[PDB]
Design a protein around this ligand. Structure first.
Ligand SMILES: COC(=O)N1CCS[C@H](c2cccs2)CC1
Length: 113
């Protein structure tokens, strides 16, 4: 009863499915679920990152029709990557992973009809 996604949002939904797919798992896995700061001992994470975001939250928002347009979806995906660049030193392995997954995202987002 949620309504058909617009053409641009269908493209966004396809990108999201790709980001979650097995073929990108080697670098996408840190982004699948909310950072569990407690479990990882990152007791400063929520002081530094005011707006956490991750792919499972983006998926829930897409399914719930929270995104009004492609720009709102893109801003959330980019917020997730920016959080990673903000919290971690630039030479961290997770930053390299973020950069790889963000390239997948940005190159396909640039193909939106
Ligand atoms: C998007 O995930 C993050 O930014 N995290 C914060 C610290 S790096 C940690 C990792 C350690 C080793 C590889 S991934 C994942 C959680």
């Amino acid at each position: 009863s949620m309504g058909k996604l617009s053409e641009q949002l269908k493209h966004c939904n396809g990108i999201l499915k790709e980001l979650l797919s097995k073929k990108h798992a080697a670098y996408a896995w840190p982004f699948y679920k909310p950072v569990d700061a407690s479990a990882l001992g990152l007791h400063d994470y929520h002081d530094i990152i005011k707006h956490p975001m991750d792919l499972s939250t983006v998926k829930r928002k897409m399914e719930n029709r929270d995104y009004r347009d492609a720009q709102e979806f893109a801003a959330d995906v980019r917020l997730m990557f920016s959080n990673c660049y903000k919290y971690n030193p630039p030479d961290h392995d997770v930053v390299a992973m973020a950069r790889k997954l963000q390239d997948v995202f940005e190159f396909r987002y640039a193909k939106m009809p």
